[PDB]
Amino acid sequence: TSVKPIFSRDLNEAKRRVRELYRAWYREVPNTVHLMQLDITVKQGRDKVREMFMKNAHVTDPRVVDLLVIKGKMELQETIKVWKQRTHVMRFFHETETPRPKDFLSKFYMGHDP
Amino acid sequence: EMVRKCDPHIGLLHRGTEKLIEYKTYLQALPYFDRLDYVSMMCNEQAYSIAV
Amino acid sequence: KRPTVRPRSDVTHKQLSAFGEYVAEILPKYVQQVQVSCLDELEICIHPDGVIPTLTFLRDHTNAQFKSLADLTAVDVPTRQNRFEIVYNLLSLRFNSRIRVKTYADELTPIDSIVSVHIAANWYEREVWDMFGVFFFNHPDLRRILTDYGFEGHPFRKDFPLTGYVELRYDDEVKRVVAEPVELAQEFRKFDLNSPWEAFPAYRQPPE
Amino acid sequence: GVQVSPSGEKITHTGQVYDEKDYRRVRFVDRQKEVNENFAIDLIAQQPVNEVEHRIIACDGGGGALGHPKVYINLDKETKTGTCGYCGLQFKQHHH
Amino acid sequence: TYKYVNKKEQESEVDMKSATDNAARILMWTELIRGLGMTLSYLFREPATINYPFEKGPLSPRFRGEHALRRYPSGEERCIACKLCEAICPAQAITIEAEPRADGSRRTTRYDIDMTKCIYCGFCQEACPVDAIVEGPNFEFSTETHEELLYNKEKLLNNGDKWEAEIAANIQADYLYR
Amino acid sequence: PTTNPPTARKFIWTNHKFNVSATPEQYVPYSTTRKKIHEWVPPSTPYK
Amino acid sequence: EEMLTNNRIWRNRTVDIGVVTAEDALNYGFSGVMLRGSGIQWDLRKTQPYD
Amino acid sequence: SKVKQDMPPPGGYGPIDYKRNLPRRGLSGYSMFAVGIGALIFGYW
Amino acid sequence: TQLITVDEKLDITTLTGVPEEHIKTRKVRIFVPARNNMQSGVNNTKKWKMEFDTRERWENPLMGWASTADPLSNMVLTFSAKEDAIAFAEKNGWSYDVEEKKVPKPKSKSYGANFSWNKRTRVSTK
Amino acid sequence: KVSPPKRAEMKTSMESLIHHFKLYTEGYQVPPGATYTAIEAPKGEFGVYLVSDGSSRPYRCKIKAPGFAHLAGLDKMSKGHMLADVVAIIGTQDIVFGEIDR
Amino acid sequence: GSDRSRFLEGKRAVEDKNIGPLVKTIMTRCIQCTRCIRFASEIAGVDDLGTTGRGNDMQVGTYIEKMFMSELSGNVIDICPVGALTSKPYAFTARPWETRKTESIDVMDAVGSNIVVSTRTGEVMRILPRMHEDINEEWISDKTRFAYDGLKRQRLTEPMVRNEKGLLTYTSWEDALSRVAGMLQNFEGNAVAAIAGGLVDAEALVALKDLLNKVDSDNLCTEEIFPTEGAGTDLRSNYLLNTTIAGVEEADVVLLVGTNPRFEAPLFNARIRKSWLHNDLKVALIGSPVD
Amino acid sequence: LHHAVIPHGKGGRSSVSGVVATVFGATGFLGRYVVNHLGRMGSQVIIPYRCDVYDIMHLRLMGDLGQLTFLEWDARDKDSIRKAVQHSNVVINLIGREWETRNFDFEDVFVNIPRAIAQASKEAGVERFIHVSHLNASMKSSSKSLRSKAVGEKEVRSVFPEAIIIRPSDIFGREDRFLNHFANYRWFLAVPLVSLGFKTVKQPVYVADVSKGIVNATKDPDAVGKTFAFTGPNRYLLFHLVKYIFGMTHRTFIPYPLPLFVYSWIGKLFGLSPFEPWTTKDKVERIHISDVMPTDLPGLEDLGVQPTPLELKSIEVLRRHRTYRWLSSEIEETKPAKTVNY
Amino acid sequence: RSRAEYVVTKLDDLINWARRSSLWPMTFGLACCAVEMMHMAAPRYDMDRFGVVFRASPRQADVMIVAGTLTNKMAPALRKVYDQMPEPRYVVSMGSCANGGGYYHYSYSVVRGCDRIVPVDIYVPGCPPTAEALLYGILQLQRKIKREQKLKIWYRR
Numbered sequence A: 001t002s003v004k005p006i007f008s009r010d011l012n013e014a015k016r017r018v019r020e021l022y023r024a025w026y027r028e029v030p031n032t033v034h035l036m037q038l039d040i041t042v043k044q045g046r047d048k049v050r051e052m053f054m055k056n057a058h059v060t061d062p063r064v065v066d067l068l069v070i071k072g073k074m075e076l077q078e079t080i081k082v083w084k085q086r087t088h089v090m091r092f093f094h095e096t097e098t099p100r101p102k103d104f105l106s107k108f109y110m111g112h113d114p
Numbered sequence B: 001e002m003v004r005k006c007d008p009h010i011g012l013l014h015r016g017t018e019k020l021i022e023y024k025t026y027l028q029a030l031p032y033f034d035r036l037d038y039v040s041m042m043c044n045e046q047a048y049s050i051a052v
Numbered sequence C: 001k002r003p004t005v006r007p008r009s010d011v012t013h014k015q016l017s018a019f020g021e022y023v024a025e026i027l028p029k030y031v032q033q034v035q036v037s038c039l040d041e042l043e044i045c046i047h048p049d050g051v052i053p054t055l056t057f058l059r060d061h062t063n064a065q066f067k068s069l070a071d072l073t074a075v076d077v078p079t080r081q082n083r084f085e086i087v088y089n090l091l092s093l094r095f096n097s098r099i100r101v102k103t104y105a106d107e108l109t110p111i112d113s114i115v116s117v118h119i120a121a122n123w124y125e126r127e128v129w130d131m132f133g134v135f136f137f138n139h140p141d142l143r144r145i146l147t148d149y150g151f152e153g154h155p156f157r158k159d160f161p162l163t164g165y166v167e168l169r170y171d172d173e174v175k176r177v178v179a180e181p182v183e184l185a186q187e188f189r190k191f192d193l194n195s196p197w198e199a200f201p202a203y204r205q206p207p208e
Numbered sequence D: 001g002v003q004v005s006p007s008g009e010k011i012t013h014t015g016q017v018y019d020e021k022d023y024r025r026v027r028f029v030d031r032q033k034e035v036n037e038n039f040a041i042d043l044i045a046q047q048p049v050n051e052v053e054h055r056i057i058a059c060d061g062g063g064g065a066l067g068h069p070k071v072y073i074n075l076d077k078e079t080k081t082g083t084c085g086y087c088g089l090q091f092k093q094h095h096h
Numbered sequence E: 001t002y003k004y005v006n007k008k009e010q011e012s013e014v015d016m017k018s019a020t021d022n023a024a025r026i027l028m029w030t031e032l033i034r035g036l037g038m039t040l041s042y043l044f045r046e047p048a049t050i051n052y053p054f055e056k057g058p059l060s061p062r063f064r065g066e067h068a069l070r071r072y073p074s075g076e077e078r079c080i081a082c083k084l085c086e087a088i089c090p091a092q093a094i095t096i097e098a099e100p101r102a103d104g105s106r107r108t109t110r111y112d113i114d115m116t117k118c119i120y121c122g123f124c125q126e127a128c129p130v131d132a133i134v135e136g137p138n139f140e141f142s143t144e145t146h147e148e149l150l151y152n153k154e155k156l157l158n159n160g161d162k163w164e165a166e167i168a169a170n171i172q173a174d175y176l177y178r
Numbered sequence F: 001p002t003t004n005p006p007t008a009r010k011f012i013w014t015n016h017k018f019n020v021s022a023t024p025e026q027y028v029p030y031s032t033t034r035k036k037i038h039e040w041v042p043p044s045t046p047y048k
Numbered sequence G: 001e002e003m004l005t006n007n008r009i010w011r012n013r014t015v016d017i018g019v020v021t022a023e024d025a026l027n028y029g030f031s032g033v034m035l036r037g038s039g040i041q042w043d044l045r046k047t048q049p050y051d
Numbered sequence H: 001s002k003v004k005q006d007m008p009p010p011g012g013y014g015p016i017d018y019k020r021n022l023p024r025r026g027l028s029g030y031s032m033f034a035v036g037i038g039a040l041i042f043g044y045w
Numbered sequence I: 001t002q003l004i005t006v007d008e009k010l011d012i013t014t015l016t017g018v019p020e021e022h023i024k025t026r027k028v029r030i031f032v033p034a035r036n037n038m039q040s041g042v043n044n045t046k047k048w049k050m051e052f053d054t055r056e057r058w059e060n061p062l063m064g065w066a067s068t069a070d071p072l073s074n075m076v077l078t079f080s081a082k083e084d085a086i087a088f089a090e091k092n093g094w095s096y097d098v099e100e101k102k103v104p105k106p107k108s109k110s111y112g113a114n115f116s117w118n119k120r121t122r123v124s125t126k
Numbered sequence J: 001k002v003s004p005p006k007r008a009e010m011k012t013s014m015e016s017l018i019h020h021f022k023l024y025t026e027g028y029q030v031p032p033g034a035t036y037t038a039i040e041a042p043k044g045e046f047g048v049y050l051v052s053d054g055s056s057r058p059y060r061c062k063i064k065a066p067g068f069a070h071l072a073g074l075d076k077m078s079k080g081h082m083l084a085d086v087v088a089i090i091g092t093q094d095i096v097f098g099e100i101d102r
Numbered sequence K: 001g002s003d004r005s006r007f008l009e010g011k012r013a014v015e016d017k018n019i020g021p022l023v024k025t026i027m028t029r030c031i032q033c034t035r036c037i038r039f040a041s042e043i044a045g046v047d048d049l050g051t052t053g054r055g056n057d058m059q060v061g062t063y064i065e066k067m068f069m070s071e072l073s074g075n076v077i078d079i080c081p082v083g084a085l086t087s088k089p090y091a092f093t094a095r096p097w098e099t100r101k102t103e104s105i106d107v108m109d110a111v112g113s114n115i116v117v118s119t120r121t122g123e124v125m126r127i128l129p130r131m132h133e134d135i136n137e138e139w140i141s142d143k144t145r146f147a148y149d150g151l152k153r154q155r156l157t158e159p160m161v162r163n164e165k166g167l168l169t170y171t172s173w174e175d176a177l178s179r180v181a182g183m184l185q186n187f188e189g190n191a192v193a194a195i196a197g198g199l200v201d202a203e204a205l206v207a208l209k210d211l212l213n214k215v216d217s218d219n220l221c222t223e224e225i226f227p228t229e230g231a232g233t234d235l236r237s238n239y240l241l242n243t244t245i246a247g248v249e250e251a252d253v254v255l256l257v258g259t260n261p262r263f264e265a266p267l268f269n270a271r272i273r274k275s276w277l278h279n280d281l282k283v284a285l286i287g288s289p290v291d
Numbered sequence L: 001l002h003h004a005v006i007p008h009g010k011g012g013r014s015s016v017s018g019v020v021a022t023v024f025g026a027t028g029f030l031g032r033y034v035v036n037h038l039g040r041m042g043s044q045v046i047i048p049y050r051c052d053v054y055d056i057m058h059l060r061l062m063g064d065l066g067q068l069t070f071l072e073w074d075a076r077d078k079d080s081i082r083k084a085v086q087h088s089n090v091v092i093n094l095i096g097r098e099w100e101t102r103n104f105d106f107e108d109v110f111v112n113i114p115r116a117i118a119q120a121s122k123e124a125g126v127e128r129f130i131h132v133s134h135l136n137a138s139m140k141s142s143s144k145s146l147r148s149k150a151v152g153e154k155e156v157r158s159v160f161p162e163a164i165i166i167r168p169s170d171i172f173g174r175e176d177r178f179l180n181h182f183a184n185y186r187w188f189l190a191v192p193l194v195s196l197g198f199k200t201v202k203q204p205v206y207v208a209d210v211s212k213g214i215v216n217a218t219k220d221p222d223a224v225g226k227t228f229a230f231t232g233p234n235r236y237l238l239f240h241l242v243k244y245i246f247g248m249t250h251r252t253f254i255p256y257p258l259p260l261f262v263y264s265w266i267g268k269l270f271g272l273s274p275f276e277p278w279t280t281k282d283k284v285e286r287i288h289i290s291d292v293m294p295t296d297l298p299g300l301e302d303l304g305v306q307p308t309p310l311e312l313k314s315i316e317v318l319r320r321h322r323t324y325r326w327l328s329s330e331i332e333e334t335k336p337a338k339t340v341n342y
Numbered sequence M: 001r002s003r004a005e006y007v008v009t010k011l012d013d014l015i016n017w018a019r020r021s022s023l024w025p026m027t028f029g030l031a032c033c034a035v036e037m038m039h040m041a042a043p044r045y046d047m048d049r050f051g052v053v054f055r056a057s058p059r060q061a062d063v064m065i066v067a068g069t070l071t072n073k074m075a076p077a078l079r080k081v082y083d084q085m086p087e088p089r090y091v092v093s094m095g096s097c098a099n100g101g102g103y104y105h106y107s108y109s110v111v112r113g114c115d116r117i118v119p120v121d122i123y124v125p126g127c128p129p130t131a132e133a134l135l136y137g138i139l140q141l142q143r144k145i146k147r148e149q150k151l152k153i154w155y156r157r
């Protein structure tokens, strides 16, 4: 139950790196929307960034949080230098994906999947 | 037109041929190498055959 | 004599065994195992902390002179604790030799990067990180090199499916190339091409 | 031979034919359902039984290496002919 | 051994004749004129262009083209549903469903070859133990829809009946090598 | 094939067909296997 | 070679373009014709022969 | 039967040239500058 | 200074990149595969295997092929130990069912039992 | 047990047919172990690192391409140059991209 | 073995037998290993197979035209190493590398034999036994082995409701469940009752039991009758094979009352015969005398 | 049902949903989105066409292999109509023109073709028919097209009595002739609206929402025999709509009050063209008629589609008409037009 | 029949003749199949003899020939270079990778056919399809675009 750290000794500086990454993403969203001709608004993209952070927000292992921070910085750098396209950025919103309903009746009526 | 940095983004012709070769047998994975280097076909076949 | 079986020379085996003892006694701090294969190939398995000293010693030593990096590879064995085995194939042009240096890692313990030793390790470790998810410390620019932008997951891992999770198609409402969950017209038929009879008695594991 | 359904479409030699209420005949609307005119079971039915003199015959399908693997057929039953499992040729032992 | 492609052995010194030759080479474009001469020689050569579609390029009897299912001289289908063509097909472009026929013969009921997956590698025709599946040398079967390249048993049997005067002769001419 | 004619068979095509793409006699794929699961047919007589 | 090798246009396009040293090629992991162009005497067919 | 196999002739194949062959054409420099200067002077006159 | 402590279960589900439904709604089996009774060879009963639950496999309209919607259908993983398979499954966040290894029971075999004077194991044919 | 027999031997002999069947369905079993084979391709040193677990399918196949390292070295080669010099460098590294991307 | 043959002679051929439409015999492939003979002599207990002849002409099978059917008769198809004794329903259908293996449990009887279902492209193709030393060893009954083809006929695929004419017509899940739910909320406790058959799992049983208990119904009956007097289903030892199959192996006298175990539970009777052969089990029967 | 029409899969490209739909106006503007939704959810779509194979060829990627059957048809060929509707359980009618040709006019296109299609569908016994009319096409309107669409509604309801009639508002999209038309008024000097664009209320509806509503009407058991009103969330006056359109275009705004009779005269002048006309008379009074308030008719909420607003779906269709100078402008750079309750 | 429709048929024949005699491809190719494409360009088969001239930019192109495997990284770029061509544009899919995924059909980073991204007019099968079969596919495309009746459909409108 004792491991070698990656960057953060404990959870607090990992949260500090998370906060810095969120700061960079929040600053980058308006520039991304202005540069690449996105149909979305700036506030919608900030909602997207916030909810991605929220789905990742349940983890408490410092090494895993450091690796998620590193992947987020890679993703951010691919957003800074324009290597993603409009399609690559817009894949986050799942607007062409019909969402699977979570109700048991709907899952029963569609098919055999649980 | 003076160049200061070159960053070749690759993987635009990437197909996961190593994973496919892993999922197939040796004779089945033999023709993957011609399409690895489609200019050096029999050289690739020679390399794979010598390894096997 | 025998036209079917490959000829075997013992002088290469003895030379590689002597060099294995040489390297093992020079570096007892990191070297965990030294073996010579029947195919006359020398492998040294080291601690992950010893990547920098082992690679620097093999590159810069007078008797080693392994100045050329042949390749840098990861092998995913998902039954051991450190599942990613990192393999460094090196070539010595002075002594006309090839050496293999092995080490281990898992998803949460990165290993040191050898861009300061060999420059091909830059792109090789970028590929290894992109395909297996092994982080590299003190790398100049570690990022994806072969997968698509925004690709989730490392596809050369064992647990990653062959067909993947996501697939692309052109959508006409949005006039874009969109990504949707994978769905195949014909599923890849897996085959059980594993004979139930033991082929090689030399590699028989004792029963548990 | 090739037979037609009540729907009007021709039946394949394996017995496959689309129903009256299938939605999958729209793929044959303004096109044609391609079927094999020569039926293998009929063509092997027209071939006469080879009357041989030995108790065990050997078949390779003709042409030597251009045929099938060489298989041996035991012609002991006089109430039925021995059939090659590869080519379908029938053999009968001549007891006269 | 090895040889030098750009290193010169010693030096040719400086001579008035050599200097004047170098001056003529610089000023009068001598290598450009000899390149023009080689280019004009290729102009006055005879072209190597065949007259498609009225002329066709040479091939070998080993050629791998459109797939086909052959028959015996009796007319029985050669295939016996052993699925070696699937088990060796690297792209998994072959699907076989089989059942006993009305006379008990072992015959396929479904034999699909997805030619948009096929890599035209001849593994099926070299793994077939009865020479049923073959790659006939037809290559001019380009279609206008994706569906028309999804072959089934009836299409492959039609190909085998169409190209039988071709495929049997090619196997007769080539079979002693394999 | 005038001094060396090919072998004549009864199943060979007596008339050659060229490529018939974008033409009414083009090839259309279909599943050549019959139905697998046969459903239960309800009876035509009411219980009451 | 008559078309290209002695051509001054080709020589202006190719000479002193993309020069790489032997130590840099060895450290960067170059192989084949590039090491030979840099001057490193190395060939797999002559050093570790096969077939 | 004797084995028939794809074999070279027993005398071997003929010699195949592989060295580079520059024809070494053209004239000397002195004569061609002489022709040039003669053209210059004749045109001027 | 270079060695910290954590009291958790080593969850990497956010790092593997698998979508959420294929983590939460999936079940895996850890088992020694049973020997194929059409053969007597038992070399396939040596390594533990983890497989996934079977999802829907339907029929294609155009050709009748087996169309599927799950990605983890052909996924089988090989393990040297049951506890190693447990560690991998708990690390990847999949709920697991484990079947114990069915070793064949040792049996008393004697050729003289075929020819007993009084006992019932005497065989009437050879 | 490795290379398939002749077709006449297949059709006239039992064990030749058995070996043909098993080779063209399952394939030959490679004994477990790892190797690295380097062959002088015209573009450079084409290497393959093959790891076999004892089955008829390879456990791992890493494809070392010379062009991958050459394109990694493209950045140093193009210092102090222009667009035409860059396309000349791309040409003279003898780059194909199937072996690079894999 | 070797990789090339020195046999330059002609091979023998043996005429095929007709022992039944289950076990298809191509007896040229037989290598005379007597496994089927020993199985029929000891486990099947029929003594209907044997070797007729001498030397190279020795043939396995029945001398007369005899239809070989007892229970447990697909295990000769299992234990025949060559393809001489194959399965006629499985004939020419699929290949073992195609067939995906699923470890399941038999429901054809109450022994609970561990089985493998072999499925190809989303369709059940074969049933094989599994090695469980405490239940069924290496064998399954013929009904278990060859009853898989009944899952492709007379199968309910869509929900049906009675029409106003009185006929069953296809409908939607919403409509069918709405009708049944309306009748369920209409009717009270004792007016609602349920009867369970034989091929039902415990999940559905507890599901329907909970539903009927929520609608206050306790008439949760099964088709099979067990005496409810005394303890009944209260004590679990009252309705169980308490000695179990290892206890069949261990016991020395067995008294069978009112049962025909050969057809009611073929693997149970097979283990009784195994104990009778090896441990000299003393077997007695009260009931009609059956073989 | 039938065994081949039972739905399967997770609703992707390769799934089967059991919708066999003959879409008659699939080569138009709404038809491409309809066939996209059907192919995306997985359906056997029959596209009868009269234009060129290249003209329908953009539809060819919009489904899986073999899920789209293209068939030539003629509006005067009942044989072609019944061979198109022969194998279907849904028949969708999107046939319509915004002008009159020498072969087909408003009454033919909006009455005779839908009546023939509905008659062939009834003879073939298809389960479901969906017919797209227009909103506020009640009767005795100022335009010939809406009276023709009303007569077509009555004919379709007479022939196939349980037809799902969908009446959408002025549908806006990428290839529409509403927003692109208003933005292409910028090529002239001014925007000549009738009464300066006031007292004319319009509530446009997005083409993706219309197509989703059509698909949900194919798969909705409660939609049989009903008339739906596909309307947007916000009502705008015509003047404010044109002002917002030109604000997103960032071109200019010069409105002009020009009377209806002479504006219809110049609309007829533009419509007298052998090609596709820029505007017609029927176009200009269909623009200048107001859209009625949907009170009793069910809508997109009842069919399960939440109507996307024009303010959210406006920049994907007007960014073409901007110049370079205002190309990289976001949503919030333009003031949205004020909505009216009436 | 009437005189005007004969005239519009003759104008259809003229326009289709021009469009099939002048067929300029975009300089696009990805793989093995692109090597076979430039082997059609080689002097033996002579697309220049057939009237077919490479132009690098899609604006000067008529036909887009998908020669190679379409990866997930390549698909948006392919859709881009297809959309930026002018309207009289055609698509020739080349080889098994471009038709139906081919030898990488079960790959994570390969789309299963270029028809999932761009509308394909003619599929040329093979791996690689020879330059013979490629010249065949080009001639088939010429026949296809001769078969179009644009002005006749416009007149019958």
Ligand SMILES: NC(=O)C1=CN([C@@H]2O[C@H](COP(=O)(O)OP(=O)(O)OC[C@H]3O[C@@H](n4cnc5c(N)ncnc54)[C@H](OP(=O)(O)O)[C@@H]3O)[C@@H](O)[C@H]2O)C=CC1
Pocket: L024, L025, L026, L027, L028, L029, L030, L031, L049, L050, L051, L075, L094, L095, L096, L097, L098, L104, L109, L132, L133, L134, L135, L168, L169, L170, L171, L172, L176, L177, L178
């Ligand atoms: N456009 C809008 O904003 C609104 C439209 N609608 C209605 O919705 C429907 C679809 O809209 P939309 O896409 O804009 O319409 P279109 O103008 O684009 O035409 C729709 C389809 O009708 C076909 N068509 C037209 N006339 C004929 C004819 N005589 N014979 C055969 N086919 C014919 C066209 O085929 P082809 O190209 O081959 O001629 C086209 O595929 C129409 O009925 C329209 O009135 C309702 C509300 C708003």
Ligand code: SF4
Pocket: E078, E079, E080, E081, E082, E083, E084, E085, E086, E096, E124, E127, E128, E129, E130, E131, E132, E133
């Ligand atoms: S290998 Fe030949 S005989 Fe065997 S299934 Fe395939 S085509 Fe038929």
Ligand code: SF4
Pocket: E085, E088, E089, E090, E091, E092, E093, E094, E113, E117, E118, E119, E120, E121, E122, E123, E124, E125
């Ligand atoms: S040629 Fe190769 S890829 Fe094609 S069907 Fe035969 S075995 Fe499969």
Ligand code: SF4
Pocket: K029, K030, K031, K032, K033, K034, K035, K036, K037, K060, K079, K080, K081, K082, K084, K085
């Ligand atoms: S089990 Fe099979 S091989 Fe053995 S004797 Fe019986 S039939 Fe012959």
Ligand code: SF4
Pocket: J018, K029, K081, K082, K083, K084
């Ligand atoms: S597969 Fe086995 S039993 Fe069948 S013929 Fe071959 S060797 Fe004999």
Ligand code: SF4
Pocket: B035, B038, E119, M031, M032, M033, M067, M068, M069, M094, M095, M096, M097, M098, M102, M103, M126, M127, M128, M129
């Ligand atoms: S179809 Fe074959 S030749 Fe063409 S790109 Fe794919 S692998 Fe290469």
Ligand SMILES: [K+]
Pocket: K076, K077, K078, K079, K080, K081, K082, K083, K084, K085, K086
């Ligand atoms: K058997």
Ligand SMILES: [Zn+2]
Pocket: D059, D060, D061, D068, D084, D085, D086, D087, D088, D089
């Ligand atoms: Zn035969």
